[PDB]
């Protein structure tokens, strides 16, 4: 999902790359560096936003999103969720779920 012209929860709700990129994306397997036995939940991920980003936009707002019609007022509940879930990075995870 880290490449220009793509979509997905990361490409749309984390970090948008414009269709006219000039540059390089490079990553390496961090299984033995970032995973712990009990799960490394220090890396947080959003699934919900009001709208898609603009390229190179960074939103660190933690505002609780209103899934329903009633306002949340910063309090979770019915149809109210935090932006950030945690990722279960473990050394026994499969390649797809590895860091």
């Amino acid at each position, epitope marked *: 999902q880290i490449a220009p012209g793509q979509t997905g929860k990361i490409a749309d709700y984390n970090y948008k790359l414009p269709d006219d990129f000039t540059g390089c994306v490079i990553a390496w397997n961090s299984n033995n560096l970032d995973s712990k036995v*009990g799960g490394n939940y*220090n890396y947080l991920y959003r699934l919900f936003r009001k709208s898609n980003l603009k390229p190179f936009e960074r939103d*660190i707002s*933690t*505002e*609780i999103y209103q899934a329903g019609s009633t306002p949340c007022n*910063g309090v979770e509940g019915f149809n109210c969720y935090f932006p950030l879930q*945690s990722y279960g990075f473990q050394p026994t995870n499969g390649v797809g779920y590895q860091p």
Partner: nanobody, 115 residues
């Protein structure tokens, strides 16, 4: 070296009250986010609460309506009011500066409640 000082825990009987504090020094650029996280021996970090620069307060469903965060703009510090305590709250807490760059965690505050 961004350093956050933790204080205000200890031993309290069921139903008591405490006031924890994280005071932040170092870089901590203006758009920061101060959170508090729970860990009991045998579990991982449980997210307790969060305040951003917007001053909005966010709390988990575990402790609904029982704990509060107070924000001090002058010293940019945070005080967590621990009220209506219950032995399910027996867990060391750590506070978390989201900031804009490298994140920094706490040294811990022992919170114990039992009878």
């Amino acid at each position: 070296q961004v350093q956050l000082q933790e204080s205000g825990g200890g031993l309290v009987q069921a139903g008591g009250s405490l006031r924890l504090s994280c005071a932040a020094s170092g870089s901590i650029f203006s758009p920061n986010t101060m959170g508090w996280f729970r860990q009991a021996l045998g579990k991982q970090r449980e997210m307790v609460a969060v305040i951003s620069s917007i001053a909005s307060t966010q709390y988990a469903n575990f402790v609904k309506g029982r704990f509060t965060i107070t924000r001090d703009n002058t010293k940019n510090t945070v005080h967590l009011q621990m009220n209506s305590l219950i032995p399910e709250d027996t867990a060391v807490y750590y506070c978390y500066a989201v900031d804009k760059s490298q994140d920094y965690w706490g040294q811990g505050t022992q919170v114990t409640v039992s009878s």
